[PDB]
């Protein structure tokens, strides 16, 4: 516990940019795109206000557009007088991917028509489309092969405090080890994480900070409408904060909280507000109506684990169950605890042979060991129960591909 | 129940079946078959023929049957075993785990075949496990997958009985003859014997 993330102070003018969403849509072969930026203000509206949105590729201006506020008629009462959508044509955009993370910069200016600037906001833009079609997850029209890993925010010394050095280090190692994707198990990350993933090129699964595993049964809170509100803020606030990052290609409703009606509702909310990315969720069986992707945890290759209510089928068999057509990407697989990863190649062989088996996120990146000092001040790696904590889960907090210090296993 | 149409020797295999001028003759082979056999309950699937590639004539006849007798699925393996002329993916000799990606008409591992993007049909091999001489190696593999996968609904082994013919030596003693033994040539030798039983019905 504590104030474990940055604290900051932001000054905004009274008439200001209160929100902006960036969307990139393409023609059939990706040779033309339209950049759409919906901009919302707070404060005093005046006829002389304008919004200019400009798009840059490095030092070259690709496109720019201006308009006064006042959005199209929405309904019987009209439109949003306090919003405006700028549409910019991009010919031959340089596409973003984890293979080549080409980015543009979108600059959003709020100003007067006489030309005085009120304020500017901006973001990195990666031109890329995410869509599921005919059973496959496609990125810019091509089927993804996810070489992912789950990664909690952990530092042997700082605990849950994340710094840019550590983040960079993680990313570089991941890339150096042929990973192209990361799942934010199981909560939204420190903001800079996304920025780095954008720039270095890694596909991200952004996940709501909702996990209620210790309930009995698991969906006890998630099926309870009295808890919808609390859950709702965890999902909606994430999307509102992370939706312009190209690195995020999928949203997740959380982790191990069964399957409740709250899930279905939130699933729909997101589909409705941001159609650009698929929504997944493993709870209640990994293939419920609250997920666009079959995303089991620890399902085996050829061997079924037919537990009641929430069986874990062989993933090969899972894809072809009667009526099933979705793609399958394991939210967690190959539990790397200690001397592990035996049978890892069996997943890869399956991934390569079966088109709808699109990969997975290994569990997980780094051991969650903490440093302790001995009587002589000599440091040592501690785990569950080492702080007098009880009850505890002993070494189960160490499941990573790397030691807490980043040395590889 | 399968119509009497097989044109394997053509090049490509659908040369005739894709030609409208052969549609009347194929049509009879199919419609006359349905008219005669439609009241038999043991008939649960109609088959358009065997190894005739995939031609538009097949599409037409598939549709006709469907219109005339909706009570039974129609299958046809020609052209890749999963064409628009079959209600069942019905490959011949597709392996269990191993893919055989021939161009145009690959033979996917059957488990993989089932979940190809957009595929939803059941899979029943029209032919599998070629029981030619000392064989049937790997049979259990098929069974194990048929049991584990709902949509893997079995197949028909190739085949029941050896097509060997009886001949007599000078001393009047009989022996089993195969291709060529009649001075028939060209011929395909022992290829006519692929049964689970000998011609006299003695088992292998
Ligand atoms: Na695949
Ligand atoms: Na763990
Ligand atoms: Na079966
Ligand atoms: Na034969």
From Swiss-Prot, chain A:
Mg(2+) 2 binds at residue 392. The active site is at 256 (proton donor), 332 (nucleophile). Na(+) binds at residues 396, 399. Coiled coil: none annotated. The record marks 152, 186 as: Transition state stabilizer. Mg(2+) 1 binds at residues 211, 213, 256. Induction: By allolactose. Homotetramer. Belongs to the glycosyl hydrolase 2 family. This is Beta-galactosidase. It comes from Escherichia coli (strain K12). The lineage of its organism: Bacteria, Pseudomonadati, Pseudomonadota, Gammaproteobacteria, Enterobacterales.
């Amino acid at each position: 516990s504590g104030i474990f993330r940055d604290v900051s102070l932001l000054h905004k003018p009274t008439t200001q940019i209160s929100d902006f969403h960036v969307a990139t849509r393409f023609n059939d072969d990706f040779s033309r795109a339209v950049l759409e930026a919906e901009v919302q203000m707070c404060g005093e509206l005046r006829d002389y206000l304008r919004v200019t949105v400009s798009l840059w590729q490095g030092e070259t201006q690709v496109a720019s557009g201006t308009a006064p506020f006042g959005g199209e008629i929405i309904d019987e009462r009209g439109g949003y007088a306090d919003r405006v959508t700028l549409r910019l044509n991009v010919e031959n955009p340089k596409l973003w991917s984890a293979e080549i993370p080409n980015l543009y910069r979108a600059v959003v200016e709020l100003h007067t028509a006489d030309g005085t600037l009120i304020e500017a906001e901006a973001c990195d833009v990666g031109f890329r489309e995410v869509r599921i079609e005919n059973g496959l997850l496609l990125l810019n029209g091509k089927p993804l092969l996810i070489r992912g890993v789950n990664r909690h925010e952990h530092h042997p010394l700082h605990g849950q405090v994340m710094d840019e050095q550590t983040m960079v280090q993680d990313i570089l190692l991941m890339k150096q080890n042929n990973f192209n994707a990361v799942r934010c198990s199981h909560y939204p990350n420190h903001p800079l994480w996304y920025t780095l993933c954008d720039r270095y090129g890694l596909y991200v699964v952004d996940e709501a900070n909702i996990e209620t595993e210790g309930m009995v049964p698991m969906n006890r809170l998630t099926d309870d409408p009295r808890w919808l509100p609390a859950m709702s803020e965890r999902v909606t606030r994430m999307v509102q904060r992370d939706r312009n990052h190209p690195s995020v290609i999928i949203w997740s409703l959380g982790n191990e909280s069964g399957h409740g009606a709250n899930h279905d509702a939130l699933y729909r909310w997101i589909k409705s507000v941001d159609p650009s990315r698929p929504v997944q969720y493993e709870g209640g069986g990994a293939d419920t109506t609250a997920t666009d992707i079959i995303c089991p945890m620890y399902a085996r290759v050829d061997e079924d684990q037919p537990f009641p209510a929430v069986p874990k089928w062989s993933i090969k068999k899972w894809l072809s169950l009667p009526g099933e057509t979705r793609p399958l990407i394991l939210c967690e697989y190959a539990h790397a605890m200690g001397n592990s990863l035996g049978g890892f190649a069996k997943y890869w062989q399956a991934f390569r042979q079966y088109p709808r088996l699109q990969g997975g996120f290994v569990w997980d990146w780094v051991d969650q060991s903490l440093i302790k000092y001995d009587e002589n001040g000599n440091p040592w790696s501690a785990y569950g129960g080492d702080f007098g904590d009880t009850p505890n889960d002993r070494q189960f907090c160490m499941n990573g591909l790397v030691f807490a210090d980043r040395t590889p296993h």
